[PDB]
Amino acid sequence: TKQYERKAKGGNLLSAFELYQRNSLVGEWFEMCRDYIQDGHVDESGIFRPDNAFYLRRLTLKDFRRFSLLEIKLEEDLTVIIGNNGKGKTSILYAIAKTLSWFVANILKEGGSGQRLSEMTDIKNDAEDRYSDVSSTFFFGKGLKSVPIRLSRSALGTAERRDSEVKPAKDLADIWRVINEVNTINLPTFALYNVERSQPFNRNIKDNTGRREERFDAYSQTLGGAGRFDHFVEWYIYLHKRTVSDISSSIKELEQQVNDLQRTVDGGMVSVKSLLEQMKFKLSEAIERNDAAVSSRVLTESVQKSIVEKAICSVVPSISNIWVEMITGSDLVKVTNDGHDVTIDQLSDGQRVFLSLVADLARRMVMLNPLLENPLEGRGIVLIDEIELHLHPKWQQEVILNLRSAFPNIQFIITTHSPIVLSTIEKRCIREFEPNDDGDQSFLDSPDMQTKGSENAQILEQVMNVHSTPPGIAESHWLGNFELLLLDNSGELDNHSQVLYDQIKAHFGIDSIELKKADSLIRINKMKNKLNKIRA
């Protein structure tokens, strides 16, 4: 109508799409939708930035599990949830993952269904209203500032049903699906990495049926919690084989075989006509696949390989190189780890788990963003539980920086109990989760102290409520006690203070911080006393 036309010309995406659907100026409206999704710019740092960003803005949980009512505002870039109560932090990530399932389902299939809330486990036990709600609001540029979705479930036998409200998410996912069908576009990545990602590696790798090469294999098991590192390995070996092979050589060979078979049938051998028809079909199929591959506007296998290799090597500190070896008639993925060439199964558990996360994510991003110069600059939402899992302190100090450098447009929602990780993150990104005894909490607070660039000892004390020294060790108290003794004896070393000084010296050593502090105390107090005597 004229109203839709005005709103569409004003930049409203849904109005533009409605006009497109009714008329199917049809070309104009399609172009407007496509430009809204595809337009972006390269910033001063050389990074591609979509004009219309997609991220989760807000989450509300009502009578869900332990929560009577919980509201969370999320950052566009990075949100980190902290707290002792780890069974509540995980509930938050689960709630988000279920909501994201609705986008994935509808991008894949018209009228696809995402995941429902459980009547048994998801409803709070003492909920008066006997229903649960998970309400999420998404953002997609200024044209679509609010995309609300609600997942709901009522208890059995209640007088009213509480149904989910999912149409806005479906409408948005339908835009992506339909526009992509006509003309390839870049698509958002959704992934969840739980503690389950730490699993042993099955070495014996499965025969490539060829599902792994399909673009929407990128959405397979994406919110299952583990990733699919097995799928990566299959896909990566596949890429290698195609890179070593020529493109359309099979077609050229098939073309030559069909030409040879055609000559035989023309020479009077009618018995081979059935075989010719089969081979012509195979040739046509190969051309069609080639054309479909050509039509799908996808990156060359060589380029895809390079992107992923670079990503892995950049993010995973111990890995400098990754490649496929063809030895003993069986393809092996090898890596240069700490300067030594090893198989994936020879990697440490920490290295493997982290490699698996990055590899999986990179594979999916390459598959979903074929039109970007750097496919890892695509949009998406990634959830990571316990990011410090198996990482040494040195890696903890680099992990968030490396992830954000490699994936600059992903919204990361993460959980940690590492002060070292928190030292690299702004306090605005931090949400603290202190429940009551019943598990319930209303809002999640940012800490009062700035964490980014702070000393880890300060974060321990000010943010995590843990002392710099272990309280259950006597020696941890000696310097404090020494100071008290000095203050009690007008700043002179008495017999008691001297004994303790000697104990500190004997235990910690002559060049210990503790002894230097003690020495400092002696010297400052001696000087204070000298001043006092001069004044007297």
Partner 1 sequence: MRELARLERPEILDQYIAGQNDWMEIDQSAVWPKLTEMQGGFCAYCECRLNRCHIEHFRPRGKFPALTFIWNNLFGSCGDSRKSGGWSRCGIYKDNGAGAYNADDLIKPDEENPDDYLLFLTTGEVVPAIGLTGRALKKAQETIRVFNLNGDIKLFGSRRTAVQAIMPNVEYLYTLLEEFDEDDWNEMLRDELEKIESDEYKTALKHAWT
Residues that bind partner 1 (CB under 8 A): 434-437, 441-443, 445, 458, 461-462, 465-468, 479-480, 483-484, 487-488, 510-511, 513, 516-517, 519-521, 523-524, 527-528, 530-531, 534
Choose the stretch contacting a second copy; rule: CB under 8 A; options: 133-141, 145-153, 287-295, 396-404: 396-404
Closest contact distance (angstroms) between CB of 528 and partner 1 is 7
Which of partner 1, a second copy, ligand ADP, none has residue 520 at its interface (CB below 5 to 8 Å by kind)?
partner 1
> What whole-number distance in Å separates Cα of residue 306 and Cα of residue 321?
11
At its nearest, how many Å lie between partner 1 and the CB of residue 492?
14
Identify the residue among 195, 313, 493, 522 touching a second copy (CB under 8 A).
Answer: 195
Please say which residue, 29 or 131, places its beta carbon nearer to ligand ADP. Answer: 131
**Among residues 125, 204, 209, 495, the one that binds a second copy under rule CB under 8 A:** 125
The dihedrals phi and psi of 445, each to the nearest 5 degrees, come to -90, 140
Smallest distance, partner 1 to C-beta of residue 403, A: 24
Under the binding rule (CB under 8 A), the answer on residue 467 touching a second copy is yes
Question: Distance between CA atoms of 443 and 73, rounded to whole angstroms?
Answer: 9
For residues 278 and 520, which CB has a smaller minimum distance to partner 1 in the complex? 520
Helices 2-9 and 13-23, packing angle to 10 deg:
130
Structure tokens at 135: 């309400």
383: Cβ–Cβ under 8 A, 6 or more apart, which residues?
Answer: 93, 96, 97, 191, 192, 193, 413, 414
Q: Which two tokens stand for residue 50?
A: 């979509």
383, β-bridge pairs = 192, 413
**H or E element at residue 371:** none
Binding residue (CB under 8 A) for a second copy from 208, 221, 290, 454:
454
Cα(402)–Cα(420) distance, integer angstroms: 15
Q: Which of residues 336-365 bind a second copy (CB under 8 A)?
A: 337-343, 345-351
Binding site for ligand ADP (CB under 6 A): 65-66, 83, 85-91, 121, 124-125, 337-338, 340, 342, 346-348, 350
Query: In 57-166, which residue ranges form alpha helices assigned H by DSSP?
Result: 86-108
Handedness of CA 313, 316, 321, 326 (dihedral sign): negative
d(CA 491, CA 530): 10
292 near a second copy, rule: CB under 8 A: no
Interface with a second copy, residue 387, by CB under 8 A: no
Q: Which is nearer to a second copy, 229 or 395 (CB)?
A: 395
Q: Is 326 in the site for a second copy (CB under 8 A)?
A: yes
Residue 260 contact, options partner 1, a second copy, ligand ADP, none, Cβ 5-8 Å cut-off depending on partner type: a second copy
User: What are the CA-CA distances from residue 199 to residues 155, 229, 352, 453 (Å)?
Assistant: 36, 10, 10, 34
